[PDB]
């Protein structure tokens, strides 16, 4: 039980919290949206020819 309690953070939870804090700070100062609707950039996406 002691060994399991002190297992190192290989799940990267504190790391994710730190990264999230960094981006929230950066985006707020910039005035950019806190979160982006599209994860992948539109420029690198090639949609089919036309809507019909």
């Amino acid at each position: 039980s002691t060994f399991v309690a002190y297992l190192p953070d290989y799940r990267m939870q504190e790391w994710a919290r730190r990264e999230a804090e960094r981006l929230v700070k950066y985006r707020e100062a910039n005035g950019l949206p806190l979160m982006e609707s599209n994860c992948f950039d539109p420029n690198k996406i090639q949609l089919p020819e036309d809507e019909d």
Binding site: A20, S37, F40, I45
Partner: protein, 175 residues
């Protein structure tokens, strides 16, 4: 405290009214506060300062890990397993970071609601507005992926959404 960044966890400047007694009766809260400070807080600070002197004698650091940016799933070929693997790992890390961003915004919202008292409905408009936008973006990005999610399914969802947006924009231009 210097533990956390005050720009990412803000709070108002904490206006506290000065004590303005009107009666001549003794204040029991003041007597109890003096007793608490003399009997509880002082030994606690003494023990803490001893612990801090012991800590200062040994100093070591741990480093936040920095990860390089790798190509995403859009640049990967159909059956190139190694680029797919790296893109998927990066996508999973970005998903975790986005979860924690939503967590930070939710903590701001909760703290505002508790702090503002009976005027929370008006004094927490900014926090509610920030949470609404972040929630909408997170829902657009990861909602309905289900168990067995991946970067490929997220890309397909985004492509479907862009096709819907393009059709809706073409419909409006014909009016």
């Amino acid at each position: 405290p210097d533990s956390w960044d005050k720009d990412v966890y803000p709070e108002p400047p904490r206006r506290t009214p000065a004590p303005a007694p009107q009666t001549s009766l003794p204040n029991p809260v003041t007597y109890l506060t003096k007793i608490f400070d003399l009997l509880v807080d002082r030994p606690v600070t003494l023990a803490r300062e001893f612990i801090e002197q012991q800590h200062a004698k040994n100093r070591y650091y741990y480093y936040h890990r920095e990860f390089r940016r790798v190509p995403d799933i859009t640049e990967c070929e159909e059956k190139d397993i190694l680029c797919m693997f790296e893109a998927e790992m990066q996508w999973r890390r970005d998903y975790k970071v986005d979860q924690e961003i939503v967590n930070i915004i939710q903590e701001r919202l909760k703290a505002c609601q508790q702090r503002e008292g009976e005027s929370y409905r008006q004094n927490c408009a900014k926090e509610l507005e920030q949470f609404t936008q972040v929630s909408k973006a997170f829902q657009d990005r990861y909602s309905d992926l289900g168990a067995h999610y991946s970067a490929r399914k997220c890309l397909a969802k985004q492509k479907q959404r862009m096709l819907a947006e393009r059709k809706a924009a073409k419909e409006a231009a014909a009016a």
